[PDB]
């Protein structure tokens, strides 16, 4: 019932001979939303990444500085404020 990987006999690490796990890591350049680059060590093989959604373009991290989108796209010729004023009679409710 319980899905497992059944263990083999464990390999005896002798006392003193235990070595620390130094994983293979590349120096990876992250360019954030704006052009600020930052180097970080990373295990995945990719020398350069550029990010789209970061803290440097999020409103929460800088307050001082897609159905709706779809609708805008396919009702663009009409250009849909003036429109609100036209279609807002407040008698009937």
């Amino acid at each position: 019932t319980r899905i497992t990987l059944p263990r083999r006999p464990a390999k005896k690490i002798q006392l003193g001979k235990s070595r620390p796990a130094i994983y293979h890591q590349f120096n990876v350049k992250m360019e954030l939303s704006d052009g600020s680059v930052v180097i970080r060590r990373s295990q995945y093989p990719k020398g350069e990444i550029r990010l789209i959604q970061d803290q440097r373009n999020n409103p929460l991290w800088n307050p001082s500085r897609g159905s709706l989108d779809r609708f805008n796209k396919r009702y663009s010729s009409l250009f849909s404020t003036v429109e609100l004023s036209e279609e807002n009679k407040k008698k009937t409710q």
């Binding site: 954030l32 704006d34 052009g35 600020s36 680059v37 930052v38 180097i39 803290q55 440097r56 929460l60 991290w61 800088n62 307050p63 001082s64 500085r65």
Partner: peptide, 20 residues
């Protein structure tokens, strides 16, 4: 939240002169 942790290299726009 403007006092950010200094990056390795600087951004395109170094300093913002306008705000709010």
């Amino acid at each position: 939240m403007e006092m950010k942790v200094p990056t390795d290299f600087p951004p395109n726009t170094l300093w913002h002169y306008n705000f709010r």
